[PDB]
């Protein structure tokens, strides 16, 4: 069509740019002593994220620091290498940008844009739940981001509020590609977060990008309800609920929202929205999105429903507090062969 043929052309250009960067990734674009450390923003099994200041410019960044020995111990080499490769190759308004990367004797470093508004998770637990217009604004961003990622044959596999950052203008930034995979056909890994796993992952089937559309259904439900559709004390009980095709909706959900959710939280793959012959357009054209101006969202011209409080550059009030630990760099090169391509 008109709008239709524009989308086709846009995604073909996007795939060409992605593939060029995928095939020749950038390496070694800064070094540690170019930055001052300010504060730990989060910690993980094999690294931490810190707010840093670039000494030359004064610009702030979020620096992910991965301990190479821990990455090896935890069998995360391929996931780490893959995350950096994806991040340096993608380009979309709602994906966090990689600004620099480098490595040293002990660590790998990914220097990303700092997103001062913090995780959606905190805002959702604080506020309780989002009204449907508010939830719809964020959902539209994810729909567009998945359309983009899926056109590159990337499955995301870890959608949840914990992984969605809110920027200064109120828009989403997706940050963590540690489980993303380039998959034209099917894949089989059991991975993700219990509450957000699609049934076909739990049932140990081969699965495809349709798991991201299931997870969108879970996200929209949690945003609009304040709690996820399937929960329990233990993950095993969560899985039993997920693979039942049973869901209950709060009485305040609109009829349109319930109908959309029935079609995303669809255990039957042949029936799940996003996985049918019209693909993502079954979602974009759904009655719940009738008021959504998809191009205006993409162009970030829609007034956001919530703007986080920002007291300047380097303000960290929207992140938790963590014990500050030294960044030791060993005199001995650790795990050099394993991380050659980083």
């Amino acid at each position: 069509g008109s709008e239709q043929e524009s989308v086709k052309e846009f995604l073909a250009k996007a795939k060409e740019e992605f593939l060029k960067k995928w095939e020749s990734p950038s390496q070694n674009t800064a070094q540690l002593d170019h930055f001052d450390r300010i504060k730990t923003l989060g910690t993980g099994s094999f690294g931490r994220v810190m707010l840093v200041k670039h000494k030359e410019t004064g610009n702030h960044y979020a620096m992910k620091i991965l301990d190479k020995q821990k990455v090896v111990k935890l069998k995360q080499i391929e996931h780490t290498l893959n995350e950096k490769r994806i991040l340096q190759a993608v380009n979309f308004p709602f994906l966090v940008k990689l600004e620099f990367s480098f490595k040293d004797n002990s660590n790998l470093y990914m220097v990303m844009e700092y997103v001062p508004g913090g995780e959606m998770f905190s805002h959702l637990r604080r506020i309780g739940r989002f009204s449907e217009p508010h939830a719809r604004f964020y959902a539209a961003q994810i729909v567009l981001t998945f359309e983009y990622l899926h056109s590159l044959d990337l499955i995301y596999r870890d959608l949840k509020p914990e992984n969605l950052l809110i920027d200064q203008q109120g828009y989403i930034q997706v940050t963590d590609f540690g489980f993303a995979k380039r998959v034209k056909g099917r894949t089989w890994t059991l991975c993700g977060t219990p509450e957000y796993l699609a049934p076909e992952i739990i049932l140990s089937k081969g699965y495809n990008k349709a798991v991201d559309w299931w997870a969108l259904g879970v996200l929209i439900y949690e945003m609009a309800a304040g709690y996820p559709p399937f929960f329990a004390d233990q993950p095993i009980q969560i899985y039993e609920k997920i693979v039942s095709g049973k869901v209950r909706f709060p009485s305040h959900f609109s009829s349109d929202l319930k109908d959309l959710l029935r079609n995303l939280l669809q255990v039957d793959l042949t029936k799940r929205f996003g996985n049918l012959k019209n693909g993502v357009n079954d979602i974009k054209n759904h009655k719940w999105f009738a008021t959504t101006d998809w191009i205006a969202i993409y162009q970030r011209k829609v007034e956001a429903p919530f703007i986080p409080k920002f007291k300047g550059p380097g303000d960290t009030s929207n992140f938790d507090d963590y014990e500050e630990e030294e960044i030791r760099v060993s005199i001995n090169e650790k795990c050099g062969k394993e991380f050659t391509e980083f």
């Binding site: 489980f179 977060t193 996820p228 929960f231 329990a232 004390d233």
Partner: peptide, 18 residues
């Protein structure tokens, strides 16, 4: 209520991957 059941689940904090 469903909300009370969610609080009783103990899974109201940040959730790790599997």
């Amino acid at each position: 209520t469903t909300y009370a059941d969610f609080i009783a689940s103990g899974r109201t904090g940040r959730r790790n991957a599997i």
